[PDB]
């Protein structure tokens, strides 16, 4: 569930919030200009020591629901209780902010999944303090696996750089994926639009508004990605170094994209709620066309076929050329006259 | 009544607007790093000389309509009448104001109603004079409680610092309480999608607009709030200590957060009108589709049950070697192709 | 078109009379008369004085007035230029408002706004007022009753309790807004007809009149506090603020009222479209259950030479034996998906 | 009327629609002098370039296009911007060079008569101490402006060609406001109407204005741009000391911009209130349809079922039928219409 | 896309153009020019180090085999290769120390079929040479070529970064004539939806919220390239060239403010839809609601005048057939002047 509620719990108090707490490990990856070590171990003791290397490190703890881990590294790296209660609560929105010692930024990672519509999303939270790069998340499995291809074939200009330029790529494998998931949505719309346009009913309603609630919610998490890109950006921390500073603006320049595009989707799927709304009415018409065209046709002519079928005795228009059938011309006639009528209107 | 009076009164009258005057309470903890006290009393000058105690203190005065009571304590603690008046002000958006002495900042708390649909506020207004916080209240039943259990149990580190941190406290329970409500809103707001594209009715758009009429107060209610934390965070005045102004950026956050969360609220709700009238529409032209299958398949029949009978004579019946059969026989044959036709038109 | 001619901009122009009152902690003397002169002496009173000239028409007085008390020919022109926005200029020696005093009238959803003009001098304030009738009797009340802390306080305080008096009677307007609100609402979740629609727009428009003159107004505000010019006194700006403040509130309900507007229209046609549903629903449940019926009536009312009609039972009630079974058949129809 | 092609960015080709007219004024003012000039020939305005004191050089007329290249080559103007100036079509804008400042706007034409709008493109070259200026057709809305000049009025004459430049475009401000409530008028007569008198047709103009509003913006919107690069770049050939004035125009076009918009939502609510009425009113002819057929259809049923041939029919003779029939109808009709009563249809 | 997992160094064609292939070249100084078109890479290689202007189209990429060849003889980087034969991507700038790589779109618009289709023009402007390629047979540069024909206008003058311009200049104009196209076409279909509605009109609103969807998403990379190509005045672009490129750029971001006007009267294009449809059936309703109203209560007086029972008012009292008829003339004129009153048809 949504459960935005801590229940008034004290601020330096650390809880987890999210339901994903079965898989806990720890993966370090320590990268210098020519030394790469990486080591996976569940005991954060042996990972700590990495708080004073020199060379740049990135540290993984994935499955923060032992929030025992959590605690020890923001003891040792100095992380504020404040900046801990916010690596723990999952239900956070995306943010940076800069201390005299670390950047600790939120994000949201987005997954989807196909013959459904939902999307799911897993807090990683990281902070650059000390030439170094700390990471939460709560799943095993995210989306930096080629900034860990990079760093590991000597890929790129991520090695010869420091910590900085491993924040950046970090982000930025964020954002790819979340290209990825644009293009997901961008899939999953294309298929409505052709489904609304070809065949309405009554259960496309209800994926147009699946698919505008997932809108809302990628505006809602996408929002806040441009805010933190621009204050990464905007204003150079002293943590963040300025040969890595244009870089950022890719990824701002990228997030940007992203609300375009997602804003472009959400009016997208407006109008098919319009063009739904356009069909039934149009439907309509053509519906009550024929309630109205035979209406009009045979409303009238059953007139005839009462008023000159009544039990009148010995009324005037008995006899004539023989009764029933001159007034059958009559009939025909009138449904001709009826029928152009309709046909010169085009109804 | 949810209306203005305060008019035609000079500006340092102080009169109370809202309609809680049931109970008057006055609570008092003063507390340090050692040893608090607890004090329930209804005398306010036994409360009086708690203004000049070094440790911290928290005076929650409950029932401001006890107009005397926040006069004496204007007058003592040394507030300007003006920020009485707005204390007493129940139609007063939340705001904050920096003064030398004090600060005073008015907060909105509010209670939704599950089985009800009406959200209900009350006004809280908190008064930080660098040794004490004095926060008046419309009513008994609050969200502070959690607060006070801290205090009564050295619970967390709210004993270990002073008074700023107090005013903290309580400004992220009334956050907290906002969340909660955003939480039974937003379980409303399911219900009333589900209920909108499963069961359209009538009373779902009267429900409907009571819900964005509720969203619309939130949201007038929550900006200011936006402002506050703002204010309190960017710029500070000796009040507040420099180690809590974190505290009050991750509070700054939350309302942050929560105006985003009543945003989407607002969008999503604005789309459900628009589904409900789409849905509407559906079932309305599905009646109709009903009416025209029934008038086509009855009406040019009923011509041909008006073509065979009236006052006449010598039309080719002659018993027409029992025609009637087969009279019925040629109705139920244009039945049919009509009702194949409509069948191909796939609105059956 | 002179660039700084005098000519009276508004229409009422009826009525005229001045009102001034020179108020102080000793003694206030208070009085009206037409003729301009009386008003020239209290220009150098040294206690505050209020002049509320009503009826801009003659713009003699007007001018008279400003002439004077060294009010700029430029500013009378202000003055005299009804159809203006609220506006707020400082000068070395006077401070000039330009505000809207709103009048709601029930029956007819009009809003009809009154220019009014306040000049501080740091020893009097003039008002002026297109015709008789002032949101401004509880001030006067005040004054003469010695209510309040206004004898007491100079000009400033004077001026500030003025543009508290017009605030108050913009939340009054607010208030009768949200009424009117309140009861659109009623109207189009239950009886919608037609002149709730007309009522709807001509509410938009009114709210938009409103948001258009307020923002002037909550910018003036802004200037008389953010900046405090010699005119104002230092210990007066938290007082403005309190209007400032309120003016805030003010700006805040009525975008809440044009956001409520907004949907308004919208559930109206919801509503609309869900009684046309049910329109349909009578016509289908009656017009499936008897036309069938009809047609049932006229199978065998064909006049023929031959017809199975002799048959057991005699004749008529055997019909319905099955006929009226239809009309039931087609009640378990509706009852199957609630058409009823 | 985009079409430009097969032709180099240097080509001066007019665009718009009005040649018929040409003429050249200059308004020569210092802070005493004043020289006042208004022929058809480039040699006479031709020595004004070097004059001190500011020049206000007005071509009306720019379809002849050798006076526009003769300004452009002897003020030292890119081709590129004589091109600019004669390309009608083309957003306003502003470009600072390292001699001259060239602004593009546009001057808007309503009149009542059916409902459309005209614009005409003028555009300024500020350069050392003259102030450029061409549009294609004769009239303006610096007739203040002018008034100022010859009368000696305000500050317009004290100050340089700044302030002149400032002068010109808060004129053309003025004008769109003036352009701003004559289309307030026309909302106004078309809310009137849709609200008094719904027509078929009345759609057309619901959404003609519409139209008209988002062309304003695409108008409208650019010069929020113009006068923003106006004060936050304000480049050395603009004083320092005019900023504030242009801070005051910028200020203007953001209250134009607030005002279109709320036009343009008005004329949506327009749109809105329409089908609304057509719903309620389409709703209302169904009511008529819904009681007539209600309350003569079982009608038609007992006139059916009792007048339907049968061998022995136990009513025969029974009774008088005919007052029994007409008192069964008038009964069911009676409390019919009592249930449409109740539901308020009737 | 066709690519899928291959390492970001392959040279795929992406494209699905591969019916023509051929190779202009046009070397143009200020003194005369020279064109030739081949199908050969040889005959194309030595203008690499030619200083005056050169223009070097190489129509239809789907041949690999000389895009890599003319790529490795001009120092292109195998990277802008790909991002070359890599249809599928948006308008792109990038800058390098020796070349100046730009990915741009053309598109075609035909009123017939109401679908306009893209093609990826990719420039490359080393020191004295403008390499470009194009995805199929034909492009909109003809008037390019035209002035380094016949010397018309300044750009045989000029370097070969005028060229550049030139060649932007020329594909931002067909972008103004495609946008006509479409006004044309919002002018047509607004006629349409206003006074003939029809689900046609629908399918194409649709179709133009779509169209005109993917026009702003390949003309904001426009803008954005065009920004850099004017104001990173890169050494690439001499500084007498940069007021062109500033030109070009005030004409995109025209073409933007036109598309995004565009976009907003095709949103309202749909509620003038609704309106009209609803108007339309209110008229239907009109006419059912009068034809059930003049003709369902003569029905019931034909039924209940023609009552097979004997007790009735019959056999002409005061000649009663045209007395019933007379009843029924006055109900009917007192419906139909009811309804003239009601002002329906
Ligand atoms: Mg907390
Ligand atoms: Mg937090
Ligand atoms: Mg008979
Ligand atoms: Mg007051
Ligand atoms: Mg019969
Ligand atoms: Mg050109």
């Not at 987005?110 to 013959?115: E, L, S």
């Amino acid at each position: 569930k949504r459960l935005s509620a801590k229940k008034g719990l004290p601020p330096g108090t650390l809880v987890y919030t999210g339901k994903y707490r079965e898989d806990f490990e720890i993966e370090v990856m320590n990268y210098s200009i020519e030394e790469f070590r990486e080591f996976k171990t569940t005991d954060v003791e042996s990972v700590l020591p990495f708080r004073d290397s020199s060379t740049p490190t990135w540290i993984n703890i994935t499955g923060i629901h032992r929030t025992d881990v959590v605690q020890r590294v923001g003891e040792f790296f100095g992380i504020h209780p404040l900046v801990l209660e916010d690596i723990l609560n999952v239900h956070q929105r995306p943010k940076v902010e800069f201390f005299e010692n670390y950047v600790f930024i939120v994000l949201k990672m987005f997954t989807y999944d196909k013959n459904l519509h939902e999307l799911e999303s897993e807090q990683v939270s990281l902070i650059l303090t000390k030439n170094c790069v700390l990471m939460f998340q709560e799943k095993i499995g995210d989306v930096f696996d080629p900034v860990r291809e990079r760093i590991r074939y000597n890929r790129g200009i991520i090695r010869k750089k420091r910590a900085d330029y491993l924040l950046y790529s970090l982000i930025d494998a964020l954002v790819d994926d979340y290209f990825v998931l644009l293009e997901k949505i961008d899939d999953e719309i294309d298929v409505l639009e052709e489904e609304v346009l070809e065949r309405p009913e009554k259960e496309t309603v209800q994926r147009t508004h699946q698919l505008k609630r997932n809108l809302v919610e990628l505006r809602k998490t996408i929002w806040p990605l441009r805010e933190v890109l621009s204050s990464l950006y905007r204003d150079v921390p002293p943590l963040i170094e300025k040969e890595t500073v244009p870089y950022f603006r890719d990824v701002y320049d990228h997030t940007i994209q992203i609300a375009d595009t997602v804003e472009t989707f959400r009016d997208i799927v407006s109008g098919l709620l319009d063009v739904y709304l356009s069909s039934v009415s149009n439907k309509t018409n053509e519906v009550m066309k024929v309630l109205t065209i035979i209406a009009t046709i045979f409303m009238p002519l059953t007139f005839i076929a009462g008023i000159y079928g009544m039990n009148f005795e010995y009324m005037p228009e008995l006899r004539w050329k023989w009764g029933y059938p001159v007034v059958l011309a009559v009939m025909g006639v009138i449904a001709v006259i009826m029928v152009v009528y309709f046909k010169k209107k085009k109804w």
